[PDB]
Amino acid sequence: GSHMEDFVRQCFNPMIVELAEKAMKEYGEDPKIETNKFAAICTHLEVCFMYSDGGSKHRFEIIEGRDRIMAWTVVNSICNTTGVEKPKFLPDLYDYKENRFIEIGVTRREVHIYYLEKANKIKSEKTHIHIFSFTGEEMATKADYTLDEESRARIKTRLFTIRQEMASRSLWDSFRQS
Ligand SMILES: [Mn+2]
Ligand SMILES: [Mn+2]
Numbered sequence: 001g002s003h004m005e006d007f008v009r010q011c012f013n014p015m016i017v018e019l020a021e022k023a024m025k026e027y028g029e030d031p032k033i034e035t036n037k038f039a040a041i042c043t044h045l046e047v048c049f050m051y052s053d054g055g056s057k058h059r060f061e062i063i064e065g066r067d068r069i070m071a072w073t074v075v076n077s078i079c080n081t082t083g084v085e086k087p088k089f090l091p092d093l094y095d096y097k098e099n100r101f102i103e104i105g106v107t108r109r110e111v112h113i114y115y116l117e118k119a120n121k122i123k124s125e126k127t128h129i130h131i132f133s134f135t136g137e138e139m140a141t142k143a144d145y146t147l148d149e150e151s152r153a154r155i156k157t158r159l160f161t162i163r164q165e166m167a168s169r170s171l172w173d174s175f176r177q178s
Contacts, residue, residue, distance in 0.1 A: 004039060004174075008031075017042055039175060043162060044105075045065065047104060047159070048064045050151070050155050055095075058096060059095060060096070062092075063091050085126055088124055098128070103129045107131055115139055118131070128144070129141045132159055134162070134163040136160055
């Protein structure tokens, strides 16, 4: 009977929450028990969807959201079609304009330690990394932020509004520490 859950349900649009429930249950975690992961997964989802919305109509292939096996199917097809090494871990998008997988991150710490953590998690150099924070800062690999400043700004505004909403419901600190 958690209220982080009711907040996540009133804050994100129903297809985000449906996909997040799908993705957490697929990895054996309960949205109703670990509600703060739930919130994080909706946030990651929505940020990715805004990010794909940011380019031109054919620029991005979306990997997040899909079922793990079809996600790997599309990754495989992108590899065997483009000539890019199959990433060790499932990415988030593929940039046809820039010929590279994109890994998106949303951190409640700051830019840095998350960027280094993911970069050494991947450590295969090929796939692009792009992190945002709940405080408006951002970073992509090689200072190549991929999108134009206004789309990324829209993302940051959304992230800070979510932070504000959680804080006003006093859920922000608990979300921050985990
Ligand atoms: Mn992912
Ligand atoms: Mn990601």
